[PDB]
Design a protein around this ligand. Structure first.
Ligand SMILES: [Mg+2]
Ligand SMILES: [Zn+2]
Lengths: 99, 49, 246, 49, 49, 146, 108, 99, 234, 234
């Protein structure tokens, strides 16, 4: 049973490849463009089940990560900006519900 | 990522996968040497990639 | 800062005299402090600081008593109840520190949880109970009639007029002509069957979010705040939060 | 030899952390009133002509 | 070296106490001997009663 | 129930109340009665404490701790983590250097606030020098280089 | 010196839209840096102006213990007290595109 | 009055280096040798000569005053003594002078 | 003598005011008086104040509410909702009940002001209100009834035996007052940050000015409280 | 002219009233006006009425409040708490304060009525209140200060910088009105069975008769609402 929807898991990330609708053949997801809510709605209405997104696990920045590699700043619901201490935010977010 | 997220999901805690991905990336920045070769590195040495 | 204003006003010329005047608790001290406070937020912190929302910038005002007054909507961020909890106040000094407080730490900016992106400044307890009580429908039965059931209103204005004159009940089911999305996403006037409390709740909901026709619980409120923040900006969401809290 | 690149070293030493507003490329920004700069450059152009 | 109230103490003085060691002087020593003799006599009077 | 019926009190204490500021009766009845209430020894008089400047330590050159000592609040590790997460370099810097242990810096900042001038440039904290002296006392050659 | 009698900057703190604030630079941290530097400059200018105003009402009273109530000095200080703070003025300047900034390292 | 504005701004640095400390460096940085296991005299409660609290090695205890109290006030900066050899400087030098 | 230690307010400050909306300020008020004054004024203003509205509409070619009028985009319900917004002001004194017969043709939009040429005892305050949208060769004929009432009266309570046959009962917003609100902020006097500051807001349809509504409500309250005088108690 | 159809009430009718309790009726009232009139009057009655109380006490042989009088069963804290409950009423016009010296001996109980001999400008309404219990040979020479005010003034605001040694500032409660109750009943005028009758029950401490308490509350409300006139709006 679907516990987490694909739309809830690809929201805010960055589409790695130009993804076309297999039926009607339009460019739904653009390479290097953040998946907004409109893209989520388009994908949920299209026959797409796996989306290849850029993740911190696979960014080649020399020091740290960078904005496209990461995705969306969940505190502001916009693209993450340069200088964000995303590591401390990640650690605090994981550790807060530990209690 | 999935195994750590399952523990939080079993109690209704919503955390984005980006945080766990950042931590796991920090968990895999080193490699284990097995052939010394002609470099200054030595055997059984955990070195940054 | 009070010493600077005292010296500037010509009341005193030295620091020690200004300190003595401050310690004497004169009306001039409070007159200076009222304007000194403005534009100078303070960081409130409750320990343990599990996430970054444990430190938040608040614009202070002078109040009587010896207890810090904290906004209820921030409590969920601080994990703070009022059974004996204590908070710490830190005062930024430099202009860059004040700018960081006003633009990165202000509680009205910390609406979303950085962990998941969902709102964290969501109504809770008495606020949610009141909103639920206002937006729940009541059906008329022969034993207990509900005043003003089945009435049609040209706008939320007429609902407000009838409610203020005690001619329609808060939980009565009525029909109101208001703006709502169509199947194409455009806002068009239509007659919706709703409740008086829902109309009153929607008088503070931004028109870009359409019309909300559901009984308000915590989950629905969280989703609604997220949607309003998605369509509008942060200040509109903050005003909406304050209004629905009231 | 520690080069003081992370947040902890700069917290201990008391320097600006390399995150947020303390990034090293924000220390070389020269600001001023746009009107004053425009007036100064207009005067410079008038003197040059 | 005075004791000063902190800027939170507001109260009313209800009692004060001073405890001192008697100064050892020669005349005070003779007076103490006379007083201890008188007290001893009074206490043998109480003993006999 | 018997005692409330004998005392002219509604059962379960369910009574209709009237608002004092408006006069309208509340929509639903509310539980009203008499409760035994205690006053605990955690009084706001003993808890409130405010410090701008005060006594500092002679070792760490940092504000003392305690209302009796007129000390300052502790900005611990977690608070620094929150400040870093927000990205406040300036606030963290003021908390680290000029508000705690930059001996010259704090005096110059007080003077600058009183006189309205610009904020002083912070210097090396004194606790770092204590750390360096302990390291040198452990026989380590610690060198600060430009 | 800008007209301090007709400024539109808020007197107290307000919820400023970050998207408008960081639209020009693409980074709110950069905008905060620029605004803070402009705020320092504005504070210096305001201090100079206030000192010039106060030098007029420099009643030469040699006594120091007595408190002197000069109405004109109090009026001037009151006028400058209710003004928006220098960081607020810098923010208003930044939102109105009245701040000039440049990077020496990038321009070299 | 206000504090004396010390114009000696801290020397900015970008690195910290650590290593083994030579005996020569320890002697070169030191102001003297601690010769007695005393800290303060039990009869006068004053720092002992050549002890762990010596004012000859670690600095004066009083501000701008020497041990024997012959040279006093700011006029006599840098003059150690003819008698007690205790420099007339700020007592804060007791946080920087080593033995 | 009775009010000597009292922290009395200065006077009412009209901060912003139009013919439709108005906001007033009362300061400084002693603790507990902002609520008293604001609630009393709001209750008097939110009572069933007097005014004129439309009580019956009778459109030819229509016999029930859920019917289609030929050539008109909106149904009868929308026409009634629009007619409920027409605001009237008395012009000729001692005019209570009036019946208006209206025939409009050759227009793409039937508005409230088009009734003005047929209305004698009243004046339409909003002549730019779209009553209905009609087609090119569409002639609309309607008989409306303008009466005098108090507050908000629904259709059931507003049916009159003098209405012509075929009329539809209409809810009537007789009251001139659209909305009344108040807020009580904290006002500082000397070392007391606990004084009160009352901010009043009145929205009115335009028949009465907000300041006039405030003065009339205050007059009613004053007249009621004058009866508790020593000479007026037996 | 729209407010002329209002049903103006006749007057306030005193049904029963002693010097302590009183019952009044307000009739006829328009639907909804009994509530506003009654609540406003109740708030003003409970909040802003003047009365006389003790502000400071000095007992011979007593240095501060946390002490004991030799021979008296009660401490000085309990004596102060009993003195707070002594209610006074005016007997001579134009008196604002009075310092009373009382010397009582030979009685096993010191009561409030013992002060009437030494009081010239006031009357003690509760002479049976037990101030303290004393032995038959214990003499109390005390001195109280009776002043005028409204509401509750703590001891910190009654501390006089010129008061003699041993003076203890005492918390003052000035409110003369103890309880206000009001009910709204249905009142019938001719063919209308929807008018209102406001029934008031006022319990005071005896310093002010209930009728004059009602008149004073009405006067305060009237003074507040007169500021809403046209001439006082800017
Ligand atoms: Mg708690
Ligand atoms: Zn010497």
């Amino acid at each position: 049973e679907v516990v987490e929807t694909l739309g809830e898991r690809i929201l805010g990330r960055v589409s790695l490849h130009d993804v076309y609708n297999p039926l009607t053949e339009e460019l739904i997801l653009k390479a290097g463009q953040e998946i907004s809510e409109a893209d989520v709605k388009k994908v949920e209405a299209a026959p797409i089940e796996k989306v290849e997104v850029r993740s911190p696990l696979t960014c080649e920045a020399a020091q740290g990560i960078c904005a496209k590699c990461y995705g969306r700043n969940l505190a502001t619901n916009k693209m993450v900006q340069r200088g964000e201490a995303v590591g401390v935010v990640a650690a605090q977010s994981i550790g807060e519900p530990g209690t | 990522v999935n195994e750590v997220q399952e523990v939080y999901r079993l109690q209704g805690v919503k955390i984005n996968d980006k945080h766990f991905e950042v931590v796991v990336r920090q968990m895999m920045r080193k490699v284990q040497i097995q052939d010394s070769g002609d470099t200054t590195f030595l055997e059984n040495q955990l070195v940054h990639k | 800062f009070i010493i600077r204003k005292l010296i500037e006003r010509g009341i005193v010329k030295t620091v020690k005299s200004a300190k003595k005047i401050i310690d004497k608790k004169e009306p001039v001290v409070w007159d200076i402090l009222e304007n000194v406070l403005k534009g100078h937020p303070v960081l409130l912190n409750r320990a343990p600081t599990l996430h970054r929302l444990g430190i938040q910038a608040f614009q202070p005002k002078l109040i009587e008593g010896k207890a810090i007054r904290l906004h209820p909507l921030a409590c969920t961020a601080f994990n703070a109840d009022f059974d004996g909890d204590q908070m710490a106040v830190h005062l930024p000094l430099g202009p860059e520190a004040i700018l960081e407080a006003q633009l990165l730490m202000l509680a009205s900016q910390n609406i979303l949880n950085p962990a998941n992106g969902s709102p964290i400044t969501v109504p809770s307890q008495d606020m949610v109970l009141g909103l639920y009580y206002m937006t729940k429908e009541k059906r008329s039965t022969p034993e207990e009639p509900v005043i003003g059931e089945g009435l049609t209103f040209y706008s939320s204005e007429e609902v407000e007029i009838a409610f203020n004159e005690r001619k329609v009940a808060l939980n009565a089911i009525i029909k109101v002509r208001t703006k709502d999305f169509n199947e194409a996403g455009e806002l068009v006037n239509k007659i919706i069957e709703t409740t008086v409390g829902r109309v009153l709740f929607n008088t503070v909901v931004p028109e870009q979010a359409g019309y909300i026709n559901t009984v308000l619980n915590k989950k629905s409120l969280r989703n609604i705040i997220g949607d309003i923040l998605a369509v509008t900006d942060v200040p509109t969401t903050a005003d909406f939060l304050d209004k629905i809290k009231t | 030899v520690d080069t003081l690149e992370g947040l902890k070293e700069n917290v201990i030493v008391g320097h600006k952390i390399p995150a947020g507003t303390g990034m090293r490329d924000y220390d070389s920004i020269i600001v001023g009133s746009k009107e004053e700069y425009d007036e100064i450059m207009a005067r410079k152009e008038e003197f040059k002509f | 070296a005075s004791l000063k109230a902190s800027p939170s103490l507001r109260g009313v003085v209800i009692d004060k106490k001073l405890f001192s060691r008697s100064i050892k002087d020669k005349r005070k020593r003779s007076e103490d001997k006379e007083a201890i003799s008188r007290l001893e006599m009074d206490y043998e009077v109480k003993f006999q009663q | 129930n018997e005692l409330t019926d004998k005392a002219g009190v509604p059962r379960f204490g369910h009574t209709y109340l009237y608002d004092g500021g408006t006069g309208q009766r509340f929509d639903q009845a509310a539980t009203v009665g008499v409760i035994y209430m205690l006053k605990l020894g955690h009084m706001v008089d003993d808890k409130m404490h405010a410090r701008s400047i005060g006594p500092y330590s002679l070792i760490t050159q940092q504000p003392l701790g305690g209302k009796a000592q007129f000390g300052g609040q502790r900005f611990g590790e977690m608070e620094v983590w929150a400040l870093e997460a927000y990205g406040a370099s300036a606030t963290l810097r003021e908390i680290l250097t000029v508000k705690s242990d930059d001996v010259i810096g704090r005096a110059k900042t007080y003077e600058s606030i009183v006189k309205g001038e610009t904020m002083p440039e912070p210097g090396l904290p004194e606790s770092f020098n204590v750390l360096m002296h302990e390291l040198k006392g452990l026989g380590l050659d610690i060198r600060l280089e430009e | 010196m800008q007209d301090l009698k007709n400024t539109k900057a808020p007197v107290s703190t307000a919820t400023l839209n970050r998207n408008e604030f960081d639209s020009k630079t693409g980074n709110i941290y950069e905008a905060i840096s620029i605004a803070s530097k402009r705020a320092v400059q504005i504070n210096s200018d305001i201090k100079k102006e206030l000192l010039e105003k106060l030098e007029e009402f420099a009643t030469y009273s040699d006594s120091l213990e007595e408190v002197f109530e000069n109405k004109e000095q109090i009026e001037v200080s009151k006028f400058y007290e209710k003004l928006p703070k220098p960081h607020a003025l810098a923010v208003q300047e930044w939102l109105e595109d009245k701040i000039y900034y440049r990077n020496t390292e990038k321009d070299a | 009055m206000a504090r004396i504005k010390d114009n000696n701004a801290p020397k900015r640095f970008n690195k910290i280096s650590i290593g083994l400390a030579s005996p020569e460096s320890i002697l070169a940085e030191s102001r003297g040798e601690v010769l007695k296991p005393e800290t303060i005299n039990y009869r006068t409660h004053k720092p002992e000569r050549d002890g762990l609290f010596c004012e000859r090695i670690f600095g004066p205890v009083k501000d701008y005053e020497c041990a024997c109290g012959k040279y006093k006030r700011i006029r006599y900066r840098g003059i150690v003594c003819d008698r007690c050899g205790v420099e007339v400087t700020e007592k804060k030098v007791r946080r920087d002078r080593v033995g | 003598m009775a009010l000597l230690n009292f922290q009395k307010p200065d006077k009412v400050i009209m901060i912003d005011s139009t013919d439709f909306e108005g906001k007033f300020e009362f300061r400084p008020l002693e603790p507990g008086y902002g609520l008293t004054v604001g609630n009393a004024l709001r209750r008097v203003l939110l009572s069933s104040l007097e005014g004129f509205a439309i009580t019956s509409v009778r459109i030819d070619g229509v016999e029930h509410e859920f019917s289609v009028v030929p050539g008109v985009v909106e149904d009868v319900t929308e026409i009634i909702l629009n007619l409920k917004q027409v605001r009237f002001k008395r012009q000729i004194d001692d005019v209570e009940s009036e019946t208006v017969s209206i025939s409009v043709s050759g227009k793409e939009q039937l508005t409230a002001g088009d009734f003005q040429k047929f209305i004698s005892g009243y004046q339409v305050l909003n002549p730019d209100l779209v009553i209905c949208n009609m087609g090119p060769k569409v002639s609309i004929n309607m008989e409306i009834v303008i009466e005098k009432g108090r507050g908000y009266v629904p259709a059931e309570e507003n049916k009159k035996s003098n209405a012509p046959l075929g009329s539809i009962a209409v809810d009537s917003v007789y009251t001139p007052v659209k909305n009344v609100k108040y807020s009580i902020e904290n006002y500082r006097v000397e070392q007391k940050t606990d004084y009160e500051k009352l901010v009043f807001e009145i929205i009115t349809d335009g028949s009465i000015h907000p300041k006039d509504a405030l003065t009339e409500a205050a007059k009613v309250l004053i007249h009621h409280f004058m009866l508790f005088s020593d000479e007026r108690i037996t």
